[PDB]
Design a protein around this ligand. Sequence first.
Ligand code: CA
Ligand code: CA
Ligand code: CA
Ligand code: CA
Ligand code: CL
Ligand code: MG
Ligand code: MG
Ligand code: MG
Ligand code: MG
Ligand code: NA
Ligand code: NA
Lengths: 560, 557
Amino acid sequence: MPKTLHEIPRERPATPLLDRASSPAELRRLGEADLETLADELRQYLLYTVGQTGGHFGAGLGVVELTIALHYVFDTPDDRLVWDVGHQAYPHKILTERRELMGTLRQKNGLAAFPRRAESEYDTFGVGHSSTSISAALGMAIAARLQGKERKSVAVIGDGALTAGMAFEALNHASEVDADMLVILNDNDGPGTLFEELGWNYIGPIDGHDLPTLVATLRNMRDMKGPQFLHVVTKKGKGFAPAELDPIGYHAITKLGGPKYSSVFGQWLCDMAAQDARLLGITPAMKEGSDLVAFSERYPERYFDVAIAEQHAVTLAAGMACEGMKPVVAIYSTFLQRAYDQLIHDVAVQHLDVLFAIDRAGLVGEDGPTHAGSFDISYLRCIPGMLVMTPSDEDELRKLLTTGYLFDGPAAVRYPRGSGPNHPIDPDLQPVEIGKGVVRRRGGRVALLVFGVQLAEAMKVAESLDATVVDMRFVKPLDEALVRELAGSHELLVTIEENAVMGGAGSAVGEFLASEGLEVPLLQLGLPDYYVEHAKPSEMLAECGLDAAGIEKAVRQRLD
Amino acid sequence: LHEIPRERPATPLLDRASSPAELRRLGEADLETLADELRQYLLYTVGQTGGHFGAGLGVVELTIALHYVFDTPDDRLVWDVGHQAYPHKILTERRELMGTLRQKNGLAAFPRRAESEYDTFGVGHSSTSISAALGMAIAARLQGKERKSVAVIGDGALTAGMAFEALNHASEVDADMLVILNDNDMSGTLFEELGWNYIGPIDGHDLPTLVATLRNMRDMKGPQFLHVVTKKGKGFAPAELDPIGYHAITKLEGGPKYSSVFGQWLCDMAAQDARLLGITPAMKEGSDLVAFSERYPERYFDVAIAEQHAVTLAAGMACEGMKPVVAIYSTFLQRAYDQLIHDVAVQHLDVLFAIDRAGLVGEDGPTHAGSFDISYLRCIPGMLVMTPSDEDELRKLLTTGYLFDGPAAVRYPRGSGPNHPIDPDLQPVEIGKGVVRRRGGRVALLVFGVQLAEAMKVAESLDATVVDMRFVKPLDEALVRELAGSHELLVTIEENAVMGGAGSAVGEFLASEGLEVPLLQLGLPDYYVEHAKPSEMLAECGLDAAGIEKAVRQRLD
Ligand SMILES: [Ca+2]
Ligand SMILES: [Ca+2]
Ligand SMILES: [Ca+2]
Ligand SMILES: [Ca+2]
Ligand SMILES: [Cl-]
Ligand SMILES: [Mg+2]
Ligand SMILES: [Mg+2]
Ligand SMILES: [Mg+2]
Ligand SMILES: [Mg+2]
Ligand code: NA
Ligand code: NA
């Protein structure tokens, strides 16, 4: 009989067998009967180390036994293993020469949040966004078949990630080319006939915590040919009672302010829905992260979780707007990249009335560059019809959400993870004038044109220089009249945005100055042209020069 | 049935069926004769204007049955892609407007909300119909309106991920909607499993069976799925015999296409490099991988209408040391942006993107315009971004991007070029260096792409310098620094949105170095250019020689 734990170890547990299984080859030197003892130990170590660093929690616990069985049966790293999303791959990392590096997990210069090709030869594909594993593993198998290399290709994909359209495309295509690969459905939330129809050989469901059945099944399927589909059933949080009971809260943990911007949005969504029965709320499977929680309890008939289906979320919004409803698509900047065609082709080309509440805009911290919201100003502002907005604090977020909502056409409001300066929030629901900035400080000589939440750091810098500071509010349409005035009365314009400099809000200013032959010097601050390694957000901002110290240095260095 | 009528057919029944309301006043016994009349009119008018041909022939009877049975426009009909909707337009107050089809200020290529209350959703890209019809159906329920929602989708469109996403969600919410699969590759278990009530397959040209089935299903509840089977080109033997050829025709009565320059390059490079792999999301003919697919069938991959899987498939292949080339139109690469960023660029994996239909594309209009790829790609770290100016440069820059170890893109337009000679070698050029084509005095034209010939006609008039920039990323920074100091105005030219484009790459560099020279950015404007001939669209945008010269002379004054 399995035991269940209710507490996290505060001290390094004794794992004498896990320590002999530091790599897959050493693991495969062990005996089948020891494997369940190895599992208990790895589970114990996993609880301990995540309690030490924080990180993802419940999903890894669900795949302890599956991960053991895969590295025992398959000749890794020669056999290719692709983890979908990778938040469940801490056990993987533990078994692939990183056990004693777990203490550096998610810290600057330590192990990254997900499998990462640069991090280890045992990581075949950098993941983070979901549902890429089947496609990636198909690519690997097609290439290995052509090269004659006789390696296996295995994709482990959760039942959630299977809701994405790109997973369906890969399953179809793999059948097309009769690829020799294995898809393991890690299902933890009449299964078989669908996958048989799509041309796969379906096996299961089997118990994903039964190591003897897992090993024998995988042994049998390892050398089967053609597209193989193994359906495994797991318990999220398995072995830790709190996580078993509340898998949502234990999806991640912290190691043992004002409101979050997502909470300011969530409150706005409720308040406007109480005033306006037209409002509909849409999320591609991120209710807790984007924080539609209270909204979905209060307005269940007007809340739509479309699963991991960004593309359908946006075109669905377009159809609702066609009937005069007022959809709000809640979506992180990094995940909106996957619905760009629907946004352009179905919303923008038709000028449809859809609001995009873009959370996690800018650097996102420990999750690193796979999740960075670095590009949405650049990829949205080039799209005709888009209203593009950058609130600088909690009050501005509520106001710009109202403005884009009420605007008759497509609008984007972008904001970062975390909390803000904690300024007062006007409880009313009124918009602001579209295309007009707010002068937050009258100065001289240097003008800081701020798009977004670096305003408070720019205010610190302006004090030393007696600079003008504008809270721009709008990337598109730009406050051209204000920029024109500032360009004639100042000797230097300085743009500041938590977005790539290339194609960004500062370049809209640059484009405006050029069209009118305004000759004023321009300094664009923002995110550089490389992928910023995972660290604390404050650490990442400092790296990019977007704290007061970096901005002052950049302005000072230009003027000297 | 053998010849496109060259004079207007007699269609007394059709002329009584100018709107769906009048259609529904006819008798079922009249409907087969209407369809014969509708088919001959369709034949006639598309022979006078050009346009899509074969798919609409396939839905003559289906369109009649839909509008006969459903109370359109109040009931919502959504056509996937829309190239099959010419029957639909003929029956929705536009029959006598069909002579303007695909001409400037005439009917658009596709259903378009701004055009007609009968068009529920502007389409062009594929596989959007189910998502849109579902949002309409959810809205109608919340509003307590009792209208129907119908999506017509082809079998190809169903290969796209977003159509699967919409089928699952429609089942999840138990939407009252009808999906009609217009299957013209000739044909249930799958759709039942996904939560749908499956009926069919039925003969999509048997009007009696169509009207009866649709009536029955019209008032069933929940997600309903009707499988109809149609013949591509039905009723016109040339088109039934060559559906690829008769997908679209020109009206009745000199250099290689750029896509064929690409296709020759792909074969030539594949002969040299066993590692090369060619991927297309269902556009073998359009991107021109025809000869490649015949000579290298084991290294050619058509993933269906599946841009997302295409790009991540390539990333996997590049992980094992193979050399994938992703052939994809600019407008369609929009749908795989995330895979390019997350799976390719973040990993700096060695994948070449051959981006066709870059710029304006003519009569298909703004749904297919390649207006944005320079803006959405150049902001992505790691990307090599190139803009060839003619046939020879396309070949050279593909070789440049292919030899590069890393993510690379080469964008080129539909149509043909200035027809300059083409070096048959496969040699690269130096990454990040432009080429001065002409030395002049007071203006410098920094040209990213195929407007170079037009710029060259203007450079004479103004005695201007002209640079073939070749690269957007990395920019030839030193050459720009030199031109900034020796000229009174820099002019950037690109067949891309000005906002965020290659002109803006130049501006960013100038601003970062304190170079204060004046900068005029020419390119595509910040609206959707209405369908017209390519030359008319380019003229509208100022990107012909005359428009480039007027723009420059204006600024100097
Ligand atoms: Ca939900
Ligand atoms: Ca405020
Ligand atoms: Ca409508
Ligand atoms: Ca040849
Ligand atoms: Cl730049
Ligand atoms: Mg799951
Ligand atoms: Mg502030
Ligand atoms: Mg078809
Ligand atoms: Mg290469
Ligand atoms: Na107030
Ligand atoms: Na043709």
